[PDB]
Design an enzyme around this catalytic site. Structure first.
Site, mmCIF file in Angstrom:
data_model
loop_
_atom_site.group_PDB
_atom_site.id
_atom_site.type_symbol
_atom_site.label_atom_id
_atom_site.label_comp_id
_atom_site.label_asym_id
_atom_site.label_seq_id
_atom_site.Cartn_x
_atom_site.Cartn_y
_atom_site.Cartn_z
ATOM 1 N N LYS A 125 0.832 -1.195 0.000
ATOM 2 C CA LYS A 125 0.000 0.000 0.000
ATOM 3 C C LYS A 125 0.873 1.253 0.000
ATOM 4 O O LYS A 125 0.552 2.245 -0.661
ATOM 5 C CB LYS A 125 -0.922 0.009 1.220
ATOM 6 N N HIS A 164 2.634 6.053 -2.297
ATOM 7 C CA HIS A 164 3.731 7.006 -2.229
ATOM 8 C C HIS A 164 4.941 6.864 -3.132
ATOM 9 O O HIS A 164 5.774 7.761 -3.163
ATOM 10 C CB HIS A 164 4.220 7.064 -0.784
ATOM 11 N N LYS A 187 -8.747 11.622 -1.361
ATOM 12 C CA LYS A 187 -7.780 11.674 -0.268
ATOM 13 C C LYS A 187 -7.303 13.127 -0.227
ATOM 14 O O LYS A 187 -6.799 13.650 -1.219
ATOM 15 C CB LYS A 187 -6.601 10.735 -0.524
ATOM 16 N N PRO A 188 -7.464 13.803 0.921
ATOM 17 C CA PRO A 188 -7.068 15.204 1.102
ATOM 18 C C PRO A 188 -5.636 15.580 0.723
ATOM 19 O O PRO A 188 -5.411 16.532 -0.026
ATOM 20 C CB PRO A 188 -7.355 15.451 2.581
ATOM 21 N N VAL A 189 -4.667 14.847 1.256
ATOM 22 C CA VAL A 189 -3.267 15.136 0.971
ATOM 23 C C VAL A 189 -2.476 13.849 0.802
ATOM 24 O O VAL A 189 -2.721 12.857 1.489
ATOM 25 C CB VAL A 189 -2.621 15.969 2.107
ATOM 26 N N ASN A 190 -1.522 13.864 -0.120
ATOM 27 C CA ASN A 190 -0.712 12.685 -0.362
ATOM 28 C C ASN A 190 0.590 13.082 -1.020
ATOM 29 O O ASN A 190 0.622 13.982 -1.854
ATOM 30 C CB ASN A 190 -1.453 11.713 -1.271
ATOM 31 N N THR A 191 1.664 12.396 -0.649
ATOM 32 C CA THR A 191 2.974 12.685 -1.209
ATOM 33 C C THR A 191 3.537 11.503 -1.989
ATOM 34 O O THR A 191 3.397 10.353 -1.578
ATOM 35 C CB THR A 191 3.970 13.056 -0.093
ATOM 36 N N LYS A 195 4.256 11.770 14.102
ATOM 37 C CA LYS A 195 3.224 12.737 14.452
ATOM 38 C C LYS A 195 2.204 12.154 15.435
ATOM 39 O O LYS A 195 1.649 12.882 16.255
ATOM 40 C CB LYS A 195 2.501 13.225 13.195
ATOM 41 N N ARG A 247 -2.377 18.202 -2.934
ATOM 42 C CA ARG A 247 -3.325 18.769 -1.985
ATOM 43 C C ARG A 247 -4.637 19.085 -2.684
ATOM 44 O O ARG A 247 -4.668 19.849 -3.648
ATOM 45 C CB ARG A 247 -2.744 20.041 -1.364
ATOM 46 N N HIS A 255 3.963 3.948 6.056
ATOM 47 C CA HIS A 255 3.225 5.193 6.221
ATOM 48 C C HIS A 255 4.133 6.374 5.936
ATOM 49 O O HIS A 255 5.297 6.376 6.322
ATOM 50 C CB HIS A 255 2.685 5.276 7.661
ATOM 51 N N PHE A 256 3.607 7.373 5.237
ATOM 52 C CA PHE A 256 4.393 8.568 4.961
ATOM 53 C C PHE A 256 3.942 9.566 6.022
ATOM 54 O O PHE A 256 2.778 9.953 6.054
ATOM 55 C CB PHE A 256 4.092 9.114 3.566
ATOM 56 N N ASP A 257 4.859 9.985 6.888
ATOM 57 C CA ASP A 257 4.506 10.889 7.979
ATOM 58 C C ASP A 257 4.625 12.379 7.698
ATOM 59 O O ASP A 257 3.750 13.155 8.094
ATOM 60 C CB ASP A 257 5.341 10.541 9.221
HETATM 61 N N1 LIG Z 1 3.646 5.486 13.244
HETATM 62 C C1 LIG Z 1 2.834 4.851 12.392
HETATM 63 N N2 LIG Z 1 3.097 3.559 12.089
HETATM 64 C C2 LIG Z 1 2.277 2.921 11.242
HETATM 65 N N3 LIG Z 1 1.186 3.373 10.621
HETATM 66 C C3 LIG Z 1 0.953 4.655 10.944
HETATM 67 C C4 LIG Z 1 1.709 5.448 11.791
HETATM 68 N N4 LIG Z 1 1.167 6.724 11.882
HETATM 69 C C5 LIG Z 1 0.110 6.672 11.109
HETATM 70 N N5 LIG Z 1 -0.091 5.443 10.523
HETATM 71 C C6 LIG Z 1 -1.191 5.013 9.655
HETATM 72 O O1 LIG Z 1 -0.658 4.349 8.532
HETATM 73 C C7 LIG Z 1 -1.582 4.482 7.415
HETATM 74 C C8 LIG Z 1 -0.831 4.913 6.182
HETATM 75 O O2 LIG Z 1 -0.758 6.343 6.125
HETATM 76 P P1 LIG Z 1 -0.511 7.109 4.710
HETATM 77 O O3 LIG Z 1 -1.672 6.733 3.811
HETATM 78 O O4 LIG Z 1 -0.498 8.582 5.082
HETATM 79 O O5 LIG Z 1 0.834 6.606 4.225
HETATM 80 C C9 LIG Z 1 -2.688 5.431 7.877
HETATM 81 O O6 LIG Z 1 -3.840 4.688 8.266
HETATM 82 P P2 LIG Z 1 -5.181 4.769 7.374
HETATM 83 O O7 LIG Z 1 -4.752 4.538 5.935
HETATM 84 O O8 LIG Z 1 -6.091 3.671 7.896
HETATM 85 O O9 LIG Z 1 -5.756 6.158 7.602
HETATM 86 C C10 LIG Z 1 -2.059 6.131 9.082
HETATM 87 O O10 LIG Z 1 -3.013 6.558 10.034
#
Ligand SMILES: Nc1ncnc2c1ncn2[C@@H]1O[C@H](COP(=O)(O)O)[C@@H](OP(=O)(O)O)[C@H]1O
Length: 124
Positions: free
Chosen positions: A7, A12, A41-45, A66, A85, A119-121
């Site tokens: 995913k 990303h 999706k509101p924001v994505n990188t 975060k 965005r 996850h992209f933080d």
């Molecule tokens: N520290 C962390 N470790 C793993 N997953 C995290 C995380 N902080 C946030 N996530 C979650 O990981 C998913 C992937 O984020 P993103 O799409 O921005 O890459 C998001 O869940 P959801 O997709 O269920 O909202 C997000 O909330």
């Protein structure tokens, strides 16, 4: 199904392009990567570096996530990225985005074995 790692790559990773994202880049990519199926999706990188370079970030600078978790890492080097965005006049299913290229350090959360990005933080 789809693994969290898969995913992350779908949402990303876009190594193909160096850094020539057109003004229409996000409108096309957000749709093609299925990030506008259920809603916009509101924001994505998107990151344009190699998968190997992005996966390597999981072994780089450990920083707080975060959400308070401690499994986030910041890249030592800056990376070519594109931020998407949703515009103010955007209305699902006709999701509209503002495309902005940048070169910054990315911060990703990693999990599992292998320990890879899921996850992209943020970017800084
Ligand atoms: N520290 C962390 N470790 C793993 N997953 C995290 C995380 N902080 C946030 N996530 C979650 O990981 C998913 C992937 O984020 P993103 O799409 O921005 O890459 C998001 O869940 P959801 O997709 O269920 O909202 C997000 O909330």
């Amino acid at each position: 199904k789809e693994t969290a790692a898969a995913k992350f790559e779908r949402q990303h990773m876009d190594s193909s392009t160096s850094a020539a994202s057109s003004s229409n880049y996000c409108n096309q990519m957000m749709k093609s990567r299925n990030l506008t199926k259920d809603r916009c999706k509101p924001v994505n990188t998107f990151v344009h570096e190699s998968l190997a370079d992005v996966q390597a970030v999981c072994s780089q600078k450990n920083v707080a996530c975060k959400n308070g978790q401690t499994n986030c890492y910041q890249s030592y080097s800056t990376m070519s990225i594109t931020d998407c965005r949703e515009t103010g006049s955007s209305k699902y299913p006709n999701c509209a985005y503002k495309t902005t290229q940048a070169n910054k350090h990315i911060i990703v959360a990693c999990e599992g074995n292998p320990y890879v990005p899921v996850h992209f933080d943020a970017s800084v």
